[PDB]
Design a protein around this ligand. Structure first.
Ligand SMILES: Nc1ncnc2c1ncn2[C@@H]1O[C@H](COP(=O)(O)OP(=O)(O)OP(=O)(O)O)[C@@H](O)[C@H]1O
Ligand SMILES: Nc1ncnc2c1ncn2[C@@H]1O[C@H](COP(=O)(O)OP(=O)(O)OP(=O)(O)O)[C@@H](O)[C@H]1O
Ligand SMILES: [Cl-]
Lengths: 172, 173
């Protein structure tokens, strides 16, 4: 169930939303704009509301699904850090338990696809990503995971994050 | 000390940010985009990051600074409702205690200037705007307002919004 068609021209990815998804067009544009101050989203080049088209930087890399088993704890911690950033910012990207196509890995790490984003006081980017990570790497038992995730969600502060971070990385 | 120059071509306001305020260009673009589903912001037409330009709908109306003392309580209540809507959405627009130039009034009510916005769990749109209103209309003592605004921030649900809305409007001439 897709909301858009993405084509590539030169160095740009052009995402054209179907007309029934104008709502998602604007959230994609909005959250990409609000995240330009950081290095973990594509550069945004243009919006065209009449065509529901967003033109942005094409990110060269591998999607997380193709290399998840080869990522070192270095790189996993950098991804966890980005999720924590989104949590702190108030942006619930959604589908972070299925980031398969939406984390692009090279020398850098870039997230794509913000069209389902919503603003939330306590987003679920880290906890959703943790579920995906445990499903793919089988780092621990679900109950142990929910213990750590309930601890982070209750505290939702840097201390609670640093504890959860090191605890996920230790299972690697 | 402004962050931009705004010019008008046809029915469009074109806001061009100075290069030192690229950061604010993106917040203006972002929050206008996130608010296009609502009718109280300009339509956004285009962004040009190389020029730090945003092209948007020109809003015809009178700025609130020019009509505040003549606005009726129904109209004030509509403005309060828009501040509440931003509160519920999580968008702190900032400078709502100096909205003089940034609320444009006609048959409709439209807010402009989101370049200083920030996401917050409990924004201060309504609480800042209440201070502007008390400064211009002299509704009550500063201490009374401050109690009412803390009660709103403590509750922050629809019922406690309605209470603060009523408490503010009841004092109007
Ligand atoms: N900036 C980009 N750089 C590189 N590849 C991109 C970029 N944007 C999109 N793509 C590619 O295009 C695909 C489709 O884009 P995207 O994932 O944003 O939408 P989708 O999930 O297919 O559709 P929707 O979310 O609208 O239902 C991505 O999975 C990715 O392979
Ligand atoms: N969409 C619009 N429709 C009509 N007039 C507009 C619009 N956008 C801006 N203006 C006019 O241009 C003026 C300047 O724009 P704006 O206040 O957004 O930016 P600014 O002068 O850089 O302010 P600040 O530095 O406080 O952000 C406004 O006070 C208003 O008179
Ligand atoms: Cl009246």
């Amino acid at each position: 169930g897709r909301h858009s068609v993405v084509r590539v021209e030169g160095d740009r990815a052009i995402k054209q939303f179907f007309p029934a998804y104008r709502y998602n067009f604007w959230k994609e544009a909005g959250f990409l704009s609000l995240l330009q101050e950081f290095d973990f989203v594509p550069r945004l080049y243009s919006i065209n509301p009449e065509k529901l088209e967003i033109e942005m930087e094409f990110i060269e890399g591998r999607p997380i699904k193709d290399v998840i088993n080869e990522l070192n704890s270095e790189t996993i911690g950098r991804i966890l850090d980005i999720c924590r950033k989104l949590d702190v910012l108030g942006i619930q990207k959604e589908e972070m338990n299925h980031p398969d196509r939406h984390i692009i890995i090279s020398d850098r790490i870039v997230f794509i696809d913000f069209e389902r984003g919503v603003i939330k006081c306590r987003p679920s980017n880290l906890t959703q990503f943790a579920v995906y990570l445990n499903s793919r790497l089988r780092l621990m038992k679900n109950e142990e995971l929910k213990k750590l995730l309930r601890e982070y969600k209750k505290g939702f502060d840097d201390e609670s994050y640093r504890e959860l971070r090191t605890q996920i990385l230790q299972y690697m």
